[PDB]
Amino acid sequence: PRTPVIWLHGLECTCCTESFIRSAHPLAKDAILSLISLDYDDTIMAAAGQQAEQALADVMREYKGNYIVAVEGNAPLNEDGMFCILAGEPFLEKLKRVSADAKAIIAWGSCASWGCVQAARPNPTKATPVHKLITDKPIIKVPGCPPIPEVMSAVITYMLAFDRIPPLDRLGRPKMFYGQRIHDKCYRRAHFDAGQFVEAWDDEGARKGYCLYKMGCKGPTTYNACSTVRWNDGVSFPIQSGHGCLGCSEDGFWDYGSFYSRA
Amino acid sequence: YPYQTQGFTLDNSGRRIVVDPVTRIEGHMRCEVNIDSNNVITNAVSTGTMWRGLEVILKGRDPRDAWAFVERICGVCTGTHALTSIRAVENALGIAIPDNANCIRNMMQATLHVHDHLVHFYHLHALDWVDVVAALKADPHQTSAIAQSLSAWPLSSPGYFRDLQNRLKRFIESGQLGPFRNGYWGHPAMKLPPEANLLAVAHYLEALDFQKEIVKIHTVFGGKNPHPNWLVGGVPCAINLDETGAVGAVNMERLNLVSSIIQKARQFCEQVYLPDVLLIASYYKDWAKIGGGLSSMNLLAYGEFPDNPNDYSASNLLLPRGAIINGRFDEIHPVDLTAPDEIQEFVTHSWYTYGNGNNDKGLHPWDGLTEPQLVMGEHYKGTKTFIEQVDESAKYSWIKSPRWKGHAMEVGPLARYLIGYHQNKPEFKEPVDQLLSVLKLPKEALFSTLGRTAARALESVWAGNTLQYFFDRLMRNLKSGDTATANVTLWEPDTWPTSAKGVGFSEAPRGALGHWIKIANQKIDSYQCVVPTTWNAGPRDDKGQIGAYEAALMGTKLAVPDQPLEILRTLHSFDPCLACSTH
Ligand code: NFU
Ligand code: SF4
Ligand code: F3S
Ligand SMILES: [Cl-]
Ligand SMILES: [Cl-]
Ligand SMILES: [Mg+2]
């Protein structure tokens, strides 16, 4: 039998689902067919409407207390939760109902983990992350907007293989990947340390790979694996491709001041 | 009020089917339809079930930061929002980006178009037309033979099909169908043999593996996919081919990788995707007469892919710009985003307000206002925590209703593809014509859910070529010694006008996208988005006039009402993205 996984979408831009499929080892194909049972997932599932709700009920009733809930997106509280409406019901109820019977909860992305963009000032929809709403179940926060494709996949393959929740930090992030600052394993660091900076775009500095700190890189305040595991089959990562870290895996990075300021 | 608007006639009596959640789309929708005694849709209703409010969140932020926020409107339609944002800012401040930047941007947008369309066909739309279990019935040796007489794609061995079939069988027989759980298998509207079924399913899986590559072009220039990075004034991926620190820059090795990916993507769309549409189309040839809606009458597009930098004139936009009215394709009206009486969005039947008694009045986006007001009307069914049935006579969606000189439009691939067709550009005409010839259908077949789906495939190939074309132009730039990636003369905010209006526009995968920004004291004052799926999924308006989605469901016969596979086809053909629609 395969570990069932119920993947919920709340308020979101669907971007961690898109990230997940970019996985190269294992292929999302191979995860879906062989590692897990991706039993409910708005984005890709064949079934709709009543047929879709039925399919969920089926798997909860059936695999009760043993299934994992993956949550991408968060839940709006204002207007009684009706800023996000699944099957005529606020997303908040659907979340509570599904996660009451779950073995553990993965919070994909910054939305589910912290709030992300909907929750940036002045947060009109009162968007609120999973762990502030579900508090009687273990939550693994795997943040970033989105998380790194091969991080997402390695977290799941780890949990299946070792049948364990990985070591979390104070914020509930798997230490394995969110344990160290981008800046503490950044390749451009040599330059930071020797005062070699990009001062403005396409200057001699930029064209030479200099440190982006002065151009507002937030790598030194920001935990993720981008500098190491890197993105999309380790092809690149934001900094390597010329732009400072936004700090997108950390709480409140949207309201941490401007992206192009030193903070 | 049994009333009639645009060709169609609408009746709010008869049975009422509900589809919520609408799956195999981005984000959250709810469709409701009425059927007559005969199982034909007499009424259709399009309710957006979410909202986040970026239009509000951006007030008082740095216009240079804007693209990064609006980027997070949507991770499926990724980067098309950022690209528009920077265009809008640049537009307002008067910034000219260098040629290589215009090239790279266009490459990244083309990469989106290719990737999005491909992921959409297989992983969102295909399971409306493909019976997965039926595929288990198939003969591998014929399946191969079919797939080989369909195309030169090399992954076709009978062994490969047998093995995938046996894998699929074990999956289904496991009793853990995952995505295939309670799917519409055996539905009478499913209409292709088990060989074409197994074939599609294989390609579905191949696509799922391959799509992951296409986006590396974003990775090289943008840093990551989804949500790559952009820059006001050009691009961050500074270029250095041959001098000392080239390892810290876009160099010859990176450009080689990018080149390598482009070729693979066009090969996949040319040999796998487009053909499988032609095969699949041929079995559903009668779906050429279902789901036209507005397509036969009213189309809109803003154009895309400027060839030369900083010229957003139609003359220089490789993708068609224009506006059709009432089936008058002889008269392709030009589009003007500055014009205030032109491009507008009403909230009349949407959960926002414009102030008292101005609810019937419509607003150009520079004046536009995103203030939410959730209230259901008289014939509403449910509570505050619950919806049994929505009241469409009042307010019924989180989506604003956009109109062009007061006409409801359809946007998207089909729209451009029709405008470009009647603009007589053979880069669109011919491939559309050859598609019709192979399927043995006429011009008018385009005006349908099938045509709309064909239009998308045709574009993935086109977009693929455009991608190569802008890579080819980047390369002739560098051969001629132009390596510039960013204008920095107005990168400092103390250099800006004290206040300035601006329009950014783009032609995103799903259709015509615009951003209407106002800068004031170095900060954002307005920021208003009119996104493609807003046009299409938009509710009704002051006039009572329906939108592209509702219109296209209208003629449809529901073979089985309990299981609305027929509705999903039509809806999915518009490539709905509701995050995108509501922002
Ligand atoms: N194409 C596309 Fe997106 Ni999720 C839409 N609608 C764009 O802006
Ligand atoms: S680019 Fe960012 S993470 Fe890298 S050395 Fe500079 S400040 Fe640190
Ligand atoms: S934007 Fe996110 S991907 Fe890494 S460099 Fe910053 S944490
Ligand atoms: Cl297996
Ligand atoms: Cl592979
Ligand atoms: Mg809007």
Numbering used by the authors:
A (entry chain F): 5 to 267
B (entry chain E): 3 to 585
Paper passage:
A strong promoter was placed upstream of the native hydABCDEFGHI operon on the S. enterica chromosome, and a stretch of sequence encoding the small subunit TM domain was replaced with DNA encoding an affinity tag. This allowed isolation and characterization of a water-soluble active variant of Hyd-5. The isolated Hyd-5 enzyme was subjected to size-exclusion chromatography before being concentrated and entered into crystallization experiments under standard aerobic conditions. Hyd-5 crystallized with three core hydrogenase αβ heterodimers in the asymmetric unit, and two of the three hydrogenase dimers associated with each other as an α2β2 heterotetramer. The third heterodimer in the asymmetric unit self-associates about a crystallographic 2-fold axis to produce the same α2β2 arrangement. The Hyd-5 structure also has strong feature in the electron density that would correspond to a hydrated Mg2+ ion. The Fe–S clusters are typical of an O2-tolerant hydrogenase, with a medial [3Fe–4S] cluster co-ordinated by three cysteine residues, and a distal cubane [4Fe–4S] cluster co-ordinated by three cysteines and one histidine. The special proximal [4Fe–3S] cluster of the small subunit is co-ordinated by six cysteine residues. Strikingly, however, a conserved histidine residue (His229) of the large subunit comes close to, and points directly at, the proximal [4Fe–3S] cluster. The distance between the large subunit His229 NE2 and Fe of the cluster is 3.3–3.5 Å, which is not a direct co-ordination of the metal, but certainly close enough to potentially have an effect on the properties of the cofactor. In the Hyd-5 structure, the Glu73 side chain appears to donate a hydrogen bond to the carbonyl of Pro230 in the large subunit, and this indicates that it is protonated.
H2 oxidation (or ‘uptake’) is catalysed in S. enterica by three [NiFe]-hydrogenases encoded by the hyaABCDEF (STM1786–STM1791), hybOABCEDFG (STM3150–STM3143), and hydABCDEFGHI (STM1539–STM1531) operons. All three S. enterica H2-uptake enzymes comprise similar ‘core’ structures with a large subunit (or α-subunit) containing the [Ni–Fe–CO–2CN−] catalytic centre, and a small subunit (or β-subunit) containing three Fe–S clusters. Whereas the hya and hyb operons are up-regulated during fermentation and anaerobic respiration respectively, the hyd operon is optimally expressed under aerobic conditions. This finding led to an initial biochemical study of Hyd-5 that revealed that Hyd-5 belongs to a class of aerobically expressed ‘O2-tolerant’ hydrogenases, i.e. [NiFe]-hydrogenases, that can sustain H2 oxidation in the presence of O2. A key feature of the O2-tolerant enzymes is the special Fe–S cluster located proximal to the [NiFe] active site.
